[PDB]
Design a protein around this ligand. Structure first.
Ligand SMILES: *[B@@]1([O])O[C]([C]C([O])=O)[C]=[C][C][C]1[N]C(=O)[C]C1=[C][C]=[C]S1
Length: 262
């Protein structure tokens, strides 16, 4: 734990890490059961919830979703770009996961019954820690001591494992979820930066923009070996504290090293 302690002291905040090697059964934990803000990392689980619903509702993924300028909140690059084209549930899901599109996230939350709807999905797969309470962009406030819109690194990792590798999703939906995570564009300097270039990685990042609060979770497939699942979350005491991608990458390296994975 000393390397993690040194890392968060250099960073000037708190770091939460949980990692599991699904081959060896080994785990690494540091503040793994503390709460950290989700920021955009909830958007991965949001896409999973959509996929789960699509198992029972034919045509859900291809359903056109109506939105205009009014729905476009800051950082909606894809939904703004394709406003004229039109977007479906599936396209919004890809946008939320891979570009962290905020309007897409809100539109999908609405289809699922809001933050409460997504929280109930996570409950249904056995996640008692996850809570989403607000919409974009209020959910990014990341106030120290505030449990709203938080989870723990361990719960995040366990739920991610259930959805990508376990049986929480039917096989086709599981693979679609994996493919969306693999295609994420926002995580190249976080967990992926700690991983050898020929290992397959799927991830979703989060960046609140305040209180040094940012994160990443991932499934990593070492070549020819069983996958690793891990979560790295950070926060800091003051509103204007900067988050650090290098710190997330470093924490992921420490996690991999702790599992004895090279
Ligand atoms: B969110 O957390 O996702 C991040 C990108 C990421 O995946 O790390 C950035 C924009 C959408 C979400 N964040 C916010 O809405 C607050 C903002 C932080 C920077 C610009 S907006």
């Amino acid at each position: 734990a000393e390397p993690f302690a040194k890392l968060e002291q250099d960073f000037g905040g708190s770091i939460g890490v949980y990692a599991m090697d699904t081959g060896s059964g080994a785990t690494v934990s540091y503040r793994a059961e503390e709460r950290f803000p989700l920021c955009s990392s909830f958007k991965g689980f949001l896409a999973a919830a959509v996929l789960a619903r699509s198992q029972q509702q034919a045509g859900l993924l291809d359903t056109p979703i109506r939105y205009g300028k009014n729905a476009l909140v800051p950082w909606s690059p894809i939904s703004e770009k394709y406003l004229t084209t039109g977007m479906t549930v599936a396209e919004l899901s890809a946008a939320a996961v891979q570009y962290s599109d905020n309007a897409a996230a809100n539109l999908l939350l609405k289809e699922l019954g809001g933050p409460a709807g997504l929280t109930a999905f996570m409950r249904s797969i056995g996640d008692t820690t996850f809570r989403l309470d607000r919409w974009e962009l209020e959910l990014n406030s990341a106030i120290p001591g505030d449990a709203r819109d938080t989870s723990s690194p361990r719960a995040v990792t366990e739920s991610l494992q259930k959805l990508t590798l376990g049986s929480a999703l039917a096989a086709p939906q599981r693979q679609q979820f994996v493919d969306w995570l693999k295609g994420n564009t926002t995580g190249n300097h976080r967990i992926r930066a700690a991983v050898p270039a020929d290992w397959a990685v799927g991830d979703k990042t989060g960046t609140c923009g305040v209180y040094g609060t940012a994160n990443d979770y991932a499934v990593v497939w070492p070549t020819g070996r069983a996958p690793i699942v891990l979560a790295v979350y950070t926060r800091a005491p003051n509103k204007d504290d900067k988050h650090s991608e290098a710190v997330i990458a470093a924490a992921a390296r420490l996690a991999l090293e702790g599992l004895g994975v090279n």
